[PDB]
Amino acid sequence: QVGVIKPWLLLGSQDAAHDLDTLKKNKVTHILNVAYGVENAFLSDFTYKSISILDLPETNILSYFPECFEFIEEAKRKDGVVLVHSNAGVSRAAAIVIGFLMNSEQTSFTSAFSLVKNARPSACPNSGFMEQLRTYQEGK
Template sequence: MQLPIRIIDGLYLGDQGAAHDLEFLVTNKITKIINCAAKHIPNHWESIGIQYLSYQWLESETQFQFDYTRCFTFINDALEAQEAVLVHSIRAINRSVFVVVLFLMRKFKWTLSKTLQYIHNLKNQFDIKPNVYQQLLNYEKWFHLTKLSNNWDVANNDDETLARNTYLNSQRTYSNEPKRKKEICLKKVQWKKNLVSQFIPPYYQIEFKKFSTPQPKIQHSQIPIKLRVQLSDNNWMNKKYTLNQIVDEQLQKKLNLFSIKSDRQPIKNIGRPGTAPSKRLLKGKVVTSSHRLLVKQS
């Protein structure tokens, strides 16, 4: 599907895809359609009120049977009522172009060459058959009863002025416009011609400097913890002890662990004075627990 082309305000040229596109028809307010290939393309939108003018033309025909006056009136009445018209065929390259060219020649009193220039500016792809082109020349001779315009200098009405300006703006050259300032760009790199190449010795002759790599400072948190293992005094494995001796040695070591040494001297029990001696009599002397010497009364 090719996009339809706006020839002038209210007149569109398209293929069968444009004729089937209801959204395009409604958006551009198209109320009339000229179907130039009615044998192959039916009139789809007659049920919604769109008027059709159908021509059952074939590409193989030598000459079209064409009612020029009826076609011109059909398009011109829609434009005067501020409505839009679509002229379409299957590919919009020969038959529909024939209808549009004849309408422009009659409405603006243009020559065939001027009209084809205008159409070619809007639509590059069209292929008018030789028999169709010959029929256009015949219509041009008939239009020559009145003076036809062959240049783009004069326009007779507003519609022609708009079409003329559209063509001239598309053909506009920018040679007369003031030159723009040169864009700022980076300088190109240029190499000097007299360059001295640097000698690179082989790898085994290159002496590399020795750099002392500083040792990283180790923080206290990063120092690994070493566990101290005390050597045990279990020499009984090397010595030949009996089982009872081994058990006694182990028990003695466990008791030594629980023994508490103190610098205080043990408190001795002091006996009451005047009590009976608790020790034996030694040669007339009595030794008591309190280390007192008592003389025997006579």
């Protein structure tokens, strides 16, 4: 099961990313793989971007944002749909989408996390990612 964040932005797991039929039913055009060592299964069928991220509280998730957000926007600009996934999709892909909403809509952490969790109930960034997200764009 995938969560709909925006009409063009989905959040899920590696199993979602491995379901070709469902991806095409969902009008997916772009897949952002922010796990580590998860195979991109359908190379001739979508545009992929892979950015290796580890689900550790000492990983700085904020550092991956410019490249992730560029690709998410590429899909929007092309009038497509991007699935952002990790392995379970609980922590890494959730944190990227939370950050994406904070950055693009200037939304607060608590509002962005609420939106994502409502769409995707499994969303639970690790404690490091959680604290990083709280801090994100404060200065801004």
